[PDB]
């Protein structure tokens, strides 16, 4: 008894090549038949655990029931032989962090694609990406879902700057080696009391908002993991980005209140973000 997970025939999936590697294993570009031929992203678990076979069904069940407009489209699994496979839609731009970086001032005009100009994005484009991520967080907050790793590296960019949350729950400085913590995105109540609620995600979204307007710079990049923990817990906030209007900064400062109850809800942050997106101050 639980969520009916769509199973896919292994012979209906032809692996093209590796797109990347993660904790879970490897991601590939592939063709999928009978879902007409169609390009898709496929995750392959490294397995070698009976437990990891349990986390697979868990994630597959949550993904199958969390389907929405700003969450990466999940098509089903393949348990017909090791390795286990998760099939998703293909977001041709890859993760939001690398996308931002490729449109930043250090990148000059090396960004490609036919859908977006190389070099910096429009203010209205930056607020579109921000608003799309917020909307995905509003949906997850609705189902009492808490994202413990909200960061631009866990979002995907598709054709026409469609941004979705691509990843949910070990060598980058993003994560502190303890359990790996992405402390730099964590509010004080998570570092100090080990609490993570909906309001925690509102604080994390503020950092995502900062990441977006810095073109994917790492929060407190000048500081170590412990130095960042000191700042966060002492009330020191990130500097406004060069490319950030005060109305956006103000939204950021609204997520960075020490008292979680003194933070605006994610539905209000979305709303303020959607508004500006339809009317970018510039
Ligand atoms: C763990 S990973 O290989 O870095 N994949 C990944 C990256 C960012 C956010 C989420 C993931 C999780 N895997 C995943 C899930 C659904 C996906 N749909 N499309 C992709 C996808 C992933 C990567 C990708 N590229 C962009 C071109 N550079 C090579 C990698 N193009 C599309 C994808 C990945």
What is the CATH number for 127?
1.10.510.10
The Å distance, Cα 89 to ligand 1 centre, comes to 10
> Resolution of the deposited coordinates, in angstroms?
2.3
Structure tokens at 42: 């496929």
Q: Answer yes or no: do 73 and 200 share one domain.
A: no
DSSP bridge pairs for 76: 87
24 is in an annotated binding site: yes
Under a CB-based contact definition with an 8 Å cutoff, are residues 182 and 151 in contact?
yes
25 is in an annotated binding site: yes
Under a CB-based contact definition with an 8 Å cutoff, are residues 10 and 80 in contact?
yes
Q: Answer yes or no: do 204 and 130 share one domain.
A: yes
Q: Report in angstroms the alpha-carbon separations of 37 from 13, 14, 31, 86, 213.
A: 10, 10, 6, 17, 38
Domain finish residue from 66, 90, 114: 90
23 is in an annotated binding site: yes
- Is the residue at 252 inside a domain? yes
- Is the residue at 282 inside a domain? no
> What CATH number is associated with residue 40?
3.30.200.20
d(CA 128, CA 162): 9
Q: Answer yes or no: do 46 and 3 share one domain.
A: yes
Secondary structure in 3-state letters for the chain:
CCCCCCECCHHHEEEEEEEEEECCEEEEEEEECCCCCCEEEEEEECCCCCCHHHHHHHHHHHHHHCCCCCECCEEEEECCCCCCEEEECCCCCEEHHHHHHHCCHHHCCCCCCCCCCCCCCCHHHHHHHHHHHHHHHHHHHHCCCCCCCCCHHHEEECCCCCEEECCCCCCCCCCEECCEECHHHCCHHHHHCCCCCHHHHHHHHHHHHHHHHHCCCCCCCCCCHHHHHHHHHHCCCCCCCCCCCHHHHHHHHHHCCCCHHHCCCHHHHHHHHHHHHCCCCC
Residue from 15, 20, 101 to probe ligand 1 pocket by mutation (most atoms less than 8 Å from CB): 20
Q: Answer yes or no: do 103 and 234 share one domain.
A: yes
**Which atom, in ligand 1's list, is nearest to the CA of 89?**
18
Structure tokens at 258: 């020490």
27 is in an annotated binding site: yes
The Å distance, Cα 266 to ligand 1 centre, comes to 26
d(CA 219, CA 150): 13
Whether residue 83 is preceded by a cis peptide bond, meaning omega within 30 degrees of 0, is: yes
Structure tokens at 61: 């069940």
Q: Answer yes or no: do 12 and 148 share one domain.
A: no
**Which atom, in ligand 1's list, is nearest to the CA of 97?**
8
The residues assigned a catalytic role are 149
Q: Answer yes or no: do 44 and 117 share one domain.
A: no
Domain count, the chain: 2
Provide the residue range defining the domain that includes 190: 91-276
Q: Answer yes or no: do 250 and 110 share one domain.
A: yes
d(CA 134, CA 202): 9
Pocket of ligand 1, beta carbon within 6 A: 19-22, 27, 41, 43, 72, 88, 90-91, 94-95, 154, 156, 166-167
The Å distance, Cα 50 to ligand 1 centre, comes to 26
Q: Answer yes or no: do 26 and 157 share one domain.
A: no
Technique behind this structure?
Answer: X-ray
**Which atom, in ligand 1's list, is nearest to the CA of 156?**
9
Domain finish residue from 56, 90, 124: 90
Q: Answer yes or no: do 74 and 190 share one domain.
A: no
């Amino acid at each position: 008894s639980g969520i009916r997970v769509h199973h896919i025939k292994r012979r209906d999936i032809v692996l093209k090549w590796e797109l990347g590697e993660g904790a879970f294993g490897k991601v590939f570009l592939a063709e999928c038949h009978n879902l007409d031929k169609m390009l898709v992203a496929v995750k392959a678990l490294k397995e070698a655990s009976e437990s990891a076979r349990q986390d697979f069904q868990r994630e597959a069940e949550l993904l199958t029931m969390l389907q929405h407009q700003h969450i990466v489209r999940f098509f089903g699994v393949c348990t017909e032989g090791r390795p286990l496979l998760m099939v998703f839609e293909y977001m041709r731009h890859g993760d939001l962090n690398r996308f931002l970086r490729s449109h930043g001032p250090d990148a000059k005009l090396l960004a490609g694609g036919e859908d977006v100009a190389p070099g910096p994005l429009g203010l209205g484009q930056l607020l579109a990406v921000a608003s799309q991520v917020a909307a995905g967080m509003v949906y997850l907050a609705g189902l009492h879902f808490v994202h413990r790793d909200l960061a631009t590296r866990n979002c995907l960019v598709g054709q026409g700057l469609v941004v979705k949350i691509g990843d949910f729950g070990i060598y980058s400085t993003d994560y502190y080696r303890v359990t790996m913590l992405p402390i730099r995105w964590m509010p004080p109540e998570s570092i100090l009391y080990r609490k993570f609620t909906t309001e925690s995600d509102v604080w994390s979204f503020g950092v995502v908002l900062w990441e977006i307007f810095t073109y994917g710079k790492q929060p407190w990049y000048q500081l170590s993991n412990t130095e960042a923990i000191d700042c966060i817990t002492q009330g020191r906030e990130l500097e406004r980005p060069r490319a950030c209007p005060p109305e956006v900064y103000a939204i950021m400062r609204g997520c960075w209140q020490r008292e979680p109850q003194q933070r605006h809800s994610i539905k209000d942050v979305h709303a303020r973000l959607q508004a500006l997106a339809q009317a970018p101050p510039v």
